[PDB]
């Protein structure tokens, strides 16, 4: 049944690198509603995330509404770890799309996002200091999808394999056994901060949802209403 | 053990750290309650119990090695951010041998259907039980539990402190103490006969659960805020989460 545990660690990494979504650009010309492009891009990236999740090993090995459950719980976490990953080499800026940067002051047009924005910046600055590698990133993102909504046994055996994968990357990188388990802990503790930002962004969008401007996507509303 | 430059946490061995975190444990509190529940009755007990555990949590954090090396403001900030995470990890630990029920206090043990007495607590109650069931399937030990609770205290609010060189030293201190607790967790797993692959998987499984504890803390923080209108100390912690 479960052919996701027979993967090579090299295969495990190679699958996640090519399953990555395409690159998305903001189709705007700067001059308005800064709350229009983020929600539009978040709307656009949710479609490929649904396509991306199908290519995550072990994801299609379970029930359709279990797949929806994991996606609806982690959809904002996945967008955030991806955003934090892209903004690493851009200190003080959050590359939503290569056409959009928005540093804190420029990003602060919107009320209530002053703190979430600087939580994403510090998370990006945290990945920068650790020099997070892309192969490590795709492993953490898959962990986010599988772990955010489990509370089953099959999901854990894939997660246990991603841990061995992450460890396999660090040992290949020359890190000692102590440096390996220390770096494993540092990365997974960041996921707790990503979850914290995910719950804050859900409440921020909700209060702004029950307002006239500016229209949210049906998919964005659908994924948000899954959190009640 | 003086400065962040030569903190006690980094001069202790693995088992001396376990001995420090096990002895730092706060006393087990009992509920000032006479056992028939009402909606305001069970609300009054849990918020009275949470406030009395908050007072002893403040003194507990000062006995976690390396915590008193931070500034007094940064000490309060870590407590303000993780106070509910700390209350909930203790509850799910106390409830491992009480399946389907949550042991808030040795005289205050609640089941799933009792948790409907407080409207909107149902969703939080099942998550707490599913996590206590989670720790039950892993047979989490007390030595590992006190490590995870100290990881929560130090890590939850670490990235929410001035852009100064002194602020960075506060950040680097927490990370070095956290690396110290990581080696302690690994040392406990190596003692129990677990292989290095097992030593990395279980450490990963434990820390991923902390992400669920953070989730339940944000759900319990919002519901508690919608349920207000609670001691001033409990409100002080809640207003710190906006
Ligand atoms: C919901 C949100 C706007 C959308 C943001 C976004 C968009 C695209 C993406 O790739 C990542 C993210 C992460 C943060 C999302 C914001 C959270 C608060 C905003 N309202
Ligand atoms: C916030 C909370 C009541 C406090 C609970 C608690 C108390 C002591 C303790 O050692 C652990 C815990 C963990 C769970 C905490 C509950 C989460 C849901 C509750 N909310 C609430 C809001 C208004 C009135 C009563 C309870």
CATH of the domain at B199: 1.10.565.10
For residues A117 and A104, give the distance between their C-alpha atoms in angstroms, rounded to a whole number. 7
Q: Is A204 annotated as a binding residue?
A: yes
Give the residue from B174, B173, B177, B207 showing the smallest Cα distance to B189. B207
How is residue B215 written in tokens? 């989730």
Q: Is B53 flagged in the annotation as binding?
A: yes
Residue entry with tokens 């007990």: B45
Q: Could you count the other beta carbons within 10 Å of the beta carbon of residue A1?
A: 6
The span from the CA of A120 to the CA of B102, in Å, is: 35
* Number of domains forming the structure of chain B: 1
Nearest to A194 by CA among B162, B155, B99: B155
Q: Residue B69 and residue B230: Cα distance in Å, rounded? A: 31
Tokens representing B22 are 């096990």
Structural contact between residues A108 and A171, judged by C-beta atoms closer than 8 angstroms: no
Does B218 reach chain A within 8 Å, measured CB to CB? yes
Nearest to B204 among A115, A184, A195 (CB): A184
Residues facing residue B208 across a β-bridge:
none
Going along chain B, which residue ranges are E strands?
Answer: 101-105, 108-111
Q: Whose CA is nearest to atom 16 of ligand 1?
A: A201
Helices A114-130 & A64-86, crossing angle to 10 degrees? 80
Ligand 2 and B50: CB distance under 6 A: yes
Q: Token pair of A154, please? A: 């099959």
H-helix segments, B62-141: 72-94, 122-138
Task: Give the DSSP H or E segment for B25.
Answer: none
Residue carrying the six token digits 């770890």: A81
Express the helix, strand and coil content of chain B in percent, nearest 5 each.
70, 5, 25
| Residue position matching structure tokens 């489990």 | A150
Exposed / middle / buried, residue B109 (Cβ in 10 Å: 0-12, 13-18, 19+): middle
Alpha carbon distance A122, A88 (integer Å): 10
Rounded CA separation A60/A67 (Å): 7
CB-neighbour burial class of residue A20 (10 A; exposed 0-12, middle 13-18, buried 19+): middle
Residue whose CA is at the smallest distance from ligand 2 atom 7: B50
B109: tokens are: 């043990």
Query: Count of CB atoms within 10 A of residue B134's CB?
Result: 19
What method did the depositors use to determine the structure? X-ray
Q: Residue A218 to residues A39, A76, A224, B45: CA-CA distances in angstroms?
A: 11, 15, 10, 42
Contact call for residues A188 and B207 (beta carbons, < 8 A)? yes
B2 CB-contact burial (10 Å; exposed 0-12 / middle 13-18 / buried 19+): exposed
Tell me the H-state helices in chain A: 9-18, 34-54, 64-86, 104-107, 114-130, 134-147, 153-172, 177-209, 218-225
Structure tokens at B222: 């919002």
Look at residues A58, A114, A109 and name the one whose alpha carbon lies nearest to residue A214.
Answer: A109
Nearest to A77 by CA among A140, A127, A13: A140
**Domain extent at residue A118:** 1-228
Resolution (A): 2.2
Q: Tell me whether B6 touches chain A (CB under 8 Å).
A: no
Give the separation between CA A62 and CA A70, rounded to whole angstroms.
11
Task: Please give the C-alpha separations between residue B191 and each of A28, B11, B143, B177, B199, in angstroms, as whole numbers.
Answer: 58, 21, 12, 21, 10
Q: How far apart are CA B171 and CA A210, in angstroms?
A: 38
Task: Give the ligand with the smallest distance to the CA of A227.
Answer: 1
């Amino acid at each position: 049944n479960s052919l996701a545990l027979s993967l090579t660690a090299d295969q495990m990494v190679s699958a996640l690198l090519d399953a990555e979504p395409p690159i998305l650009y903001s189709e705007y010309d700067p001059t308005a509603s800064m709350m229009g492009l983020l929600t539009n891009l978040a709307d656009r990236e949710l479609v490929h995330m649904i396509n991306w999740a199908k290519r995550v090993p072990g994801f299609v090995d379970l029930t359709l509404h279990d797949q929806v459950h994991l996606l609806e719980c982690a959809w904002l976490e996945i967008l955030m770890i991806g955003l934090v990953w892209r903004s690493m080499e851009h200190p003080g800026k959050l590359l939503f799309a290569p056409n959009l940067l928005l540093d804190r002051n420029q990003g602060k047009c919107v009320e209530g996002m002053v703190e979430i924005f600087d939580m994403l910046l510090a998370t990006s600055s945290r990945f920068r200091m650790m020099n997070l590698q892309g192969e490590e990133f795709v492993c953490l993102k898959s962990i986010i999808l599988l772990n955010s909504g489990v509370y089953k046994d099959h999901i854990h055996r894939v997660l246990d394999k991603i841990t061995d994968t992450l460890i396999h990357l660090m040992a290949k990188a020359g890190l000692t056994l102590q440096q390996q388990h220390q770096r494993l802990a540092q990365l997974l503790l960041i996921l707790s901060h990503i979850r914290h930002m995910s719950n804050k962004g859900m409440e921020h969008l909700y209060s702004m949802k029950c307002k006239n401007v500016v229209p949210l996507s049906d998919l964005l509303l659908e994924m948000l209403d899954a959190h009640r």
